[PDB]
């Protein structure tokens, strides 16, 4: 129940299967002749963006349908554009 995620830089990340099905594209890449019988190779994504992309999943899954007021995601101004052009690709 674990899936790998390799970035273009080289750093490899690992997260739960159910925690990485919120994006349609990552589901499409795992369905077809790509059953991989898993490690998904991204060819055009740096590492710093991919870190926060992984961090977003736990934040989304944990604080859903919860009465407790939710806090705010901290996003640095410098990198803000790249998360946008990456979420466009990943459809998150």
């Amino acid at each position: 129940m674990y899936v790998k995620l390799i970035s273009s830089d080289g750093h490899e990340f690992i997260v739960k299967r159910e925690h990485a099905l919120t994006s349609g594209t990552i589901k499409a890449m795992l369905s077809g002749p790509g059953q991989f019988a898993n490690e998904v190779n991204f060819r055009e994504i740096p590492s710093h963006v991919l870190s926060k992309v992984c961090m977003y999943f736990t934040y989304k899954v944990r604080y859903t349908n919860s009465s407790t007021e939710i806090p705010e995601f901290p996003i640095a101004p410098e990198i803000a554009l790249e998360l946008l052009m990456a979420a466009n690709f990943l459809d998150c």
Partner: protein, 88 residues
């Protein structure tokens, strides 16, 4: 049949962004008034027009006698016939 849905995934971006934005709405389809169509459902409208409609004589005729022979006593393969009827 398995060809189409394994290709529909590869064209997800086209269906999401470019197509479905310049197509016709369901309301436009109903009540008349008011064609771009999605990949993976376009490969299912070139099987009707060029493979079964130019052939809908022999397919019906060989069936409507095999069923009769089965009525009179015959052992036809259930899976083969069932797939052909399920195709329509």
């Amino acid at each position: 049949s398995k060809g189409a849905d394994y290709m529909d995934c590869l064209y997800r971006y086209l269906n999401t962004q470019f197509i479905k934005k310049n197509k016709l709405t369901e309301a436009d389809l109903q009540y008349g008034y008011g064609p771009l169509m999605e990949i993976g459902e376009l490969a299912l409208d070139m099987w009707r027009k060029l493979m079964v409609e130019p052939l809908q004589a022999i397919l019906i005729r060989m069936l409507l006698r095999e069923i009769k022979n089965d009525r009179g006593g015959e052992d036809p393969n259930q899976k083969v016939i069932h797939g052909v009827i399920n195709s329509f």
